[PDB]
Enzyme design. Sequence first.
Site, short mmCIF file in Angstrom:
data_model
loop_
_atom_site.label_atom_id
_atom_site.label_comp_id
_atom_site.label_asym_id
_atom_site.label_seq_id
_atom_site.Cartn_x
_atom_site.Cartn_y
_atom_site.Cartn_z
N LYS A 1 0.85 -1.63 -0.21
CA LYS A 1 -0.42 -0.34 0.32
C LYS A 1 0.66 1.05 -0.27
CE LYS A 1 -4.51 1.51 1.57
NZ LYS A 1 -4.27 2.60 1.18
N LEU B 1 3.44 1.67 -1.60
CA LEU B 1 4.46 2.09 -3.47
C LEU B 1 3.05 3.30 -3.81
CD1 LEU B 1 5.34 -1.16 -4.10
CD2 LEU B 1 6.39 0.74 -3.12
N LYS C 1 -6.41 -8.00 -1.61
CA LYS C 1 -5.74 -8.95 -2.88
C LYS C 1 -4.61 -9.65 -2.56
CE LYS C 1 -9.26 -7.72 -6.84
NZ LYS C 1 -9.62 -6.63 -6.35
N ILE D 1 -7.20 -9.56 -33.11
CA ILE D 1 -8.87 -10.41 -32.44
C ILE D 1 -8.80 -9.07 -31.13
CG2 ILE D 1 -10.10 -11.92 -31.48
CD1 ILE D 1 -9.95 -13.40 -32.89
N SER E 1 12.02 -3.75 -27.10
CA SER E 1 13.38 -4.71 -25.97
C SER E 1 14.67 -5.03 -26.05
CB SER E 1 12.91 -5.96 -25.81
OG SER E 1 12.53 -7.15 -26.69
N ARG F 1 17.21 -2.27 -25.76
CA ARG F 1 17.36 -2.31 -24.02
C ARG F 1 17.72 -3.07 -22.93
NH1 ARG F 1 11.52 -1.82 -24.14
NH2 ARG F 1 10.96 -3.93 -22.60
N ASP G 1 8.97 -9.93 -30.66
CA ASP G 1 9.06 -9.47 -32.06
C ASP G 1 10.05 -8.13 -32.43
OD1 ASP G 1 8.38 -6.49 -30.76
OD2 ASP G 1 6.55 -6.66 -32.76
MG LIG Z 1 8.74 -5.00 -28.90
NA NA Z 2 6.53 -4.40 -32.07
NA NA Z 3 -5.54 -9.66 -29.90
NA NA Z 4 -0.66 3.20 -2.60
#
Ligand SMILES: [Mg+2]
Ligand code: NA
Ligand code: NA
Ligand code: NA
Length: 326
Positions: free
Chosen positions: A51, A53, A63, A97, A171, A174, A181
């Site tokens: 909490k 954070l 939860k 989709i 990515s 990075r 992908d």
């Molecule tokens: Mg990517």
């Molecule tokens: Na991409």
């Molecule tokens: Na999708």
């Molecule tokens: Na908080």
Amino acid sequence: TLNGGITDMLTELANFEKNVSQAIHKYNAYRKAASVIAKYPHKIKSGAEAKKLPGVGTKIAEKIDEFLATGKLRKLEKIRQDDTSSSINFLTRVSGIGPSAARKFVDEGIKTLEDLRKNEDKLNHHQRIGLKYFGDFEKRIPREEMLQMQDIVLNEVKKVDSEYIATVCGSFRRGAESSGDMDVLLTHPSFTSESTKQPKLLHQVVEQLQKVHFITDTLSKGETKFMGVCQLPSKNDEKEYPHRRIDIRLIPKDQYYCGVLYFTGSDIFNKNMRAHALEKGFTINEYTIRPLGVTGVAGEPLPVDSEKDIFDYIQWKYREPKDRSE
DNA sequence: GTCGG
DNA sequence: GCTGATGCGCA
DNA sequence: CCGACGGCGCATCAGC
Ligand SMILES: [Mg+2]
Ligand code: NA
Ligand code: NA
Ligand code: NA
Ligand SMILES: [Mg+2]
């Protein structure tokens, strides 16, 4: 990793809100919470410790209490059991989709990969190709293969015209050991904020990547963004590499730095950097950073000579690409 | 679902 | 054909 | 309390 159970729980909740409830803000709330918890350097012992954070409120903390006590979440157990919920979730894993289209298909009795194959006439082009490669697209790309893909793309681009600069972002830039992908930023001197001196600059690159059989399919394509499918060549007798998603984005050359910041990500990092800019009275997109006026609307582009310059404006210390991952 | 004002 | 809205994708 | 919450390219459809 340190709090994997909690962040997995929050991601799964985020996906349910996005795909089933179509409640995009709850989705963003869970993603933010998941992100902040993922970077937290201790094992979380209570929900009240979480909490503290930012982005973790009362509901997530409860939860987390239930997750740490019982090792699971009842809310989520019942979602895994709901037939309509799990089906809607599954169908969204097909590229093309989304939540809307997934709910449509489930209402028409279309709930599985087989039902989709048996009903290819109901699918637009994008969805056709997403189904075709459903399995390949679920796989990640080892960095070693990304390095081969980079070499192919840079070299083929250099053959169309030596003035193009291609930079692989996402990515990969990075420093990740694997990618979902391939993301390619493109610049050419003839395309700037001032003028498009030369037409079809993206087309000619796509076309050449098709000629040599690297790009195999197209999901969508326009003057500045290509979204489709590619594949590395394999050796004699060898199993084929999986087909891979590739995105190519042409950005005016005088706006490279805002482009590379955008396209390097991560997505949640981009969302938070941009949010922080607004607190500071700026708006950042992939082209520019503009000051927000005394009314609300954005002024004129501020000068940028580097990634760092965008960080300086909003008074953030520079984060190296590798430090912008979730 | 969360948070600053 | 246009524009504006919406779905879906990207980081 | 609440309304604010990154930003945009392409595909598609509705209304003209
Ligand atoms: Mg990517
Ligand atoms: Na991409
Ligand atoms: Na999708
Ligand atoms: Na908080
Ligand atoms: Mg992604």
